[PDB]
Amino acid sequence: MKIINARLRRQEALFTLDLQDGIIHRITAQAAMQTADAGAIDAQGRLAIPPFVEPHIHLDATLTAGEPEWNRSGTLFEGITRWSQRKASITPEDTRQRALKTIGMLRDFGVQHVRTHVDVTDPSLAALQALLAVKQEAADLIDLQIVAFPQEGIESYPNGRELMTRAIEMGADVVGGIPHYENTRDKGVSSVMFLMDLAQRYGRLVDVHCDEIDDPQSRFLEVLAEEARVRGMGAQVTASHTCAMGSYDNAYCSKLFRLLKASGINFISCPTESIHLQGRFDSWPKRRGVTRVAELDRAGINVCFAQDSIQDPWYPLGNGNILRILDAGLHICHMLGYDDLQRCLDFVTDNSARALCLGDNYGLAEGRPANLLILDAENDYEAVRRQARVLTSIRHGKVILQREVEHIRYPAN
Amino acid sequence: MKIINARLRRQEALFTLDLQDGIIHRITAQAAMQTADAGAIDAQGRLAIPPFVEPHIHLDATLTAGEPEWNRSGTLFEGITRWSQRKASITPEDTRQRALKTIGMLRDFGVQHVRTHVDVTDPSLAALQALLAVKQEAADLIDLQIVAFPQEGIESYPNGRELMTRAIEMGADVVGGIPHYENTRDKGVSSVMFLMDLAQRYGRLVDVHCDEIDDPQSRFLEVLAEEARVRGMGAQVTASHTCAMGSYDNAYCSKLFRLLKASGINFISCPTESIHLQGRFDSWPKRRGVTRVAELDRAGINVCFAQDSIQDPWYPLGNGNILRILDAGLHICHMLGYDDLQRCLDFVTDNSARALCLGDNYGLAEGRPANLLILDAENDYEAVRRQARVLTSIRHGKVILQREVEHIRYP
Ligand SMILES: Nc1nc(=O)[nH]cc1F
Ligand SMILES: Nc1nc(=O)[nH]cc1F
Ligand SMILES: [Fe+2]
Numbered sequence: 001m002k003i004i005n006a007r008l009r010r011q012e013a014l015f016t017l018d019l020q021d022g023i024i025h026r027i028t029a030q031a032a033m034q035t036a037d038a039g040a041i042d043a044q045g046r047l048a049i050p051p052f053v054e055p056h057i058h059l060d061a062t063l064t065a066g067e068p069e070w071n072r073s074g075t076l077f078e079g080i081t082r083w084s085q086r087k088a089s090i091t092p093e094d095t096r097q098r099a100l101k102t103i104g105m106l107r108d109f110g111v112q113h114v115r116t117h118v119d120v121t122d123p124s125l126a127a128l129q130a131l132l133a134v135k136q137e138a139a140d141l142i143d144l145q146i147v148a149f150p151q152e153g154i155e156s157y158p159n160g161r162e163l164m165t166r167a168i169e170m171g172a173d174v175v176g177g178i179p180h181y182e183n184t185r186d187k188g189v190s191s192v193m194f195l196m197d198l199a200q201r202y203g204r205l206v207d208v209h210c211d212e213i214d215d216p217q218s219r220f221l222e223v224l225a226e227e228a229r230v231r232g233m234g235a236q237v238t239a240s241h242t243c244a245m246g247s248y249d250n251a252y253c254s255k256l257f258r259l260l261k262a263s264g265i266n267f268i269s270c271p272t273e274s275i276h277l278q279g280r281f282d283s284w285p286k287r288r289g290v291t292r293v294a295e296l297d298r299a300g301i302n303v304c305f306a307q308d309s310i311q312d313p314w315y316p317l318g319n320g321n322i323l324r325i326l327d328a329g330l331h332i333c334h335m336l337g338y339d340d341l342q343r344c345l346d347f348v349t350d351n352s353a354r355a356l357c358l359g360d361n362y363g364l365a366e367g368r369p370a371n372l373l374i375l376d377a378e379n380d381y382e383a384v385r386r387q388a389r390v391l392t393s394i395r396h397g398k399v400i401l402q403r404e405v406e407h408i409r410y411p412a413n
Numbered sequence: 414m415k416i417i418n419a420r421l422r423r424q425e426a427l428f429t430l431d432l433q434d435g436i437i438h439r440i441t442a443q444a445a446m447q448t449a450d451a452g453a454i455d456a457q458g459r460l461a462i463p464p465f466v467e468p469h470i471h472l473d474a475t476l477t478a479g480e481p482e483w484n485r486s487g488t489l490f491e492g493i494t495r496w497s498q499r500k501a502s503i504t505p506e507d508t509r510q511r512a513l514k515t516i517g518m519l520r521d522f523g524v525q526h527v528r529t530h531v532d533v534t535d536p537s538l539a540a541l542q543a544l545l546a547v548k549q550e551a552a553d554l555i556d557l558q559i560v561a562f563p564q565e566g567i568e569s570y571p572n573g574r575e576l577m578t579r580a581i582e583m584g585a586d587v588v589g590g591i592p593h594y595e596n597t598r599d600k601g602v603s604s605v606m607f608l609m610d611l612a613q614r615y616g617r618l619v620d621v622h623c624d625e626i627d628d629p630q631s632r633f634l635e636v637l638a639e640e641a642r643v644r645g646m647g648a649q650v651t652a653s654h655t656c657a658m659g660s661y662d663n664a665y666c667s668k669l670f671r672l673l674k675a676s677g678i679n680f681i682s683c684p685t686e687s688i689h690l691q692g693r694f695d696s697w698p699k700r701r702g703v704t705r706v707a708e709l710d711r712a713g714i715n716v717c718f719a720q721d722s723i724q725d726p727w728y729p730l731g732n733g734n735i736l737r738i739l740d741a742g743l744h745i746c747h748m749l750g751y752d753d754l755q756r757c758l759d760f761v762t763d764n765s766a767r768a769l770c771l772g773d774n775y776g777l778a779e780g781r782p783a784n785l786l787i788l789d790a791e792n793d794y795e796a797v798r799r800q801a802r803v804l805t806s807i808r809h810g811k812v813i814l815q816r817e818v819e820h821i822r823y824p
């Protein structure tokens with residue numbers, strides 16, 4: 001299949017992309033606009049990018065907001081209580097139906113790579129069973145990674161170490177954790193030691209809910225980064241949230257950055273989720289509660305944005321559109337400078353792909369899989385400013401989604 | 414013209430809206446999802462609302478981002494510097510062309526009511542002249558209100574008082590102000606006294622940029638509210654921004670609220686603008702810098718949301734879509750409760766209309782102007798969740814915008 005008149009990120013020239021056998025066969029700069037022969041897609045000067053990535057979402061909990069009760073306080077902790085209640089009625093088929101519906105939303109907005117956390121603090125591991133099957137069933141739309149996520153703690157929940165182990169042995173791709181939620185500081189530390197041992201023993205990736213709390217004493221990130229560094233696993237390890245970093249002592253944080261850089265770990269921020277869940281224990285002034293995204297990025301540290309929740313016990317909105325999350329993140333993290341906006345798509349594509357260790361299975365380069373979108377915009381700035389629609393989504397060389405370009409009529413002239 | 418099968422806000426019932434001679438002739442409850450007759454518009458269970466309002470925007474500065482230099486710090490103060498530079502080459506034609514294009518964006522997203530601030534710290538009053546003209550020219554799309562806004566201060570700029578007076582004489586609807594930017598506290602206070610005298614003498618509305626700064630000592634709001642209360646002009650008065658309130662001592666703020674309630678003034682918050690401009694002088698933790706929107710609303714005080722800027726020396730983004738602003742404000746102000754979401758369109762429709770004193774010229778009631786939208790959603794919650802598109806905009810009983818319903822194909 002041929003795509004002509006396509007823009008590529010941060011370049012002026014138009015390109016033709018030749019897709020064959022499910023991979024990108026050739027990419028070639030054109031002289032100017034050209035005409036689509038039969039069986040050629042004309043991108044019409046629109047941007048072609050690799051697919052959006054959703055590197056952190058809770059598909060087991062998606063679409064359960066209000067069941068059986070609402071999170072009245074809007075806090076992380078009440079959300080956990082509400083989820084605990086909903087867990088009483090989770091079945092594999094219930095999980096499957098909700099997850100597939102949310103996957104449809106992600107697909108509608110150009111997401112082809114998803115990393116989902118699944119709560120394994122449930123002796124039945126019902127949601128895990130369902131999502132391991134969804135991974136197979138939904139492969140025509142997405143590549144799904146599954147994180148074994150001990151929502152109620154590893155050290156603090158009955159048989160927590162055993163449940164994490166079962167989940168990894170069943171084939172969860174990523175080992176999770178929640179050290180700030182363990183009952184004591186010492187158990188928070190030992191949970192990190194366990195999960196890293198587990199990840200290393202089974203050769204899995206790591207993605208830990210790390211310091212998702214406004215307490216400036218929540219410093220489990222240093223433990224994770226140092227284990228990553230010592231074990232030589234940096235690239236395989238992601239720290240999600242790190243909200244407490246947004247409240248750290250600045251002298252400590254400056255020291256910390258040396259280790260963060262040295263460890264080579266990745267960071268995920270969920271700005272719409274954290275703006276909603278953080279700052280709840282302040283009066284006024286009210287902190288933003290988001291990690292230091294701009295600063296990590298300027299230090300050469302890989303950071304990206306994620307939606308986290310869609311209509312679940314923690315977050316009542318969500319429609320699958322990662323560009324809305326990008327917009328929120330640039331605002332809250334003070335990244336609306338000219339240079340930030342010229343490359344802002346990094347934070348929902350390339351950086352996220354690096355966090356998920358997609359390697360050569362991602363990106364527009366000859367020889368890589370033919371997975372791409374055509375966006376209704378010419379560049380990064382216009383993409384975020386207009387919240388550009390995904391006009392075409394192509395997966396394994398096939399068109400899986402097509403939108404018409406919006407047309408507004410003015411009947412009164 | 415007849416619209417059938419329309420949802421109205423916060424009800425499950427279906428309605429027919431009958432429009433004649435530019436007004437809403439009849440609103441009738443239906444007993445079913447009806448088959449449409451040849452002439453009728455079938456809303457198909459979609460929500461009909463009065464138009465979105467943009468109660469605070471700077472049209473004179475719109476689409477000037479980067480001219481002649483960028484706001485590198487992303488601060489309110491550098492923004493004023495860059496604007497001062499851009500103002501050096503502002504002309505009426507320049508203002509008119511940019512303002513019309515942004516008005517086009519606002520129209521595209523269902524905005525029919527707009528209050529623009531115009532910088533009158535300019536002895537040529539170029540932008541004001543242009544916008545007074547645009548108010549008439551663009552009346553087929555929007556009802557525009559103009560605020561005489563002394564960007565560089567009243568007491569603090571050469572002939573500031575005389576320029577404010579001249580701007581009002583020329584026909585500005587609203588008297589503006591910027592007390593926290595005056596050079597001393599005492600001059601901030603005197604500027605409020607002057608601007609209230611000016612508004613009261615010429616019978617104009619008031620809308621002040623009030624305490625747009627993270628300084629907890631910035632307390633001009635109390636002076637503004639007290640003057641409003643004493644003069645009996647609360648309903649005519651609006652305080653825009655009030656970012657400092659998000660940093661006030663809490664005992665003081667609790668006391669202040671009694672005055673805010675008694676004064677009857679309105680509040681406008683610009684969440685995307687403030688999240689961008691505020692908190693710049695903190696390290697960590699970093700404050701939100703937005704006023705106490707949820708608290709004002711719970712105290713029965715009228716508050717609403719606005720875009721503030723579209724691609725200007727203060728804010729590099731913007732596309733005219735007020736629903737994105739609503740989204741931002743609900744998140745940043747911690748108003749994502751179930752109850753909040755069920756009525757969240759208040760903050761970009763009814764509340765804003767109240768701030769602009771639109772009265773019976775606004776709202777879906779018999780006898781009122783046939784100005785309304787059909788949104789691609791059934792209720793407030795879905796409208797903000799999906800960022801619902803405006804499918805139809807009707808003004809004075811005529812369709813002025815039509816969008817196709819989006820249809821995704823899956824091959
Ligand atoms: N933000 C969240 N934190 C958690 O620990 N669980 C689920 C969530 F959505
Ligand atoms: N937020 C703003 N404050 C001002 O004083 N001027 C212009 C703006 F856009
Ligand atoms: Fe999460």
Ligand SMILES: [Fe+2]
Pocket residue numbers: 469471530622653721
């Ligand atoms: Fe303003």
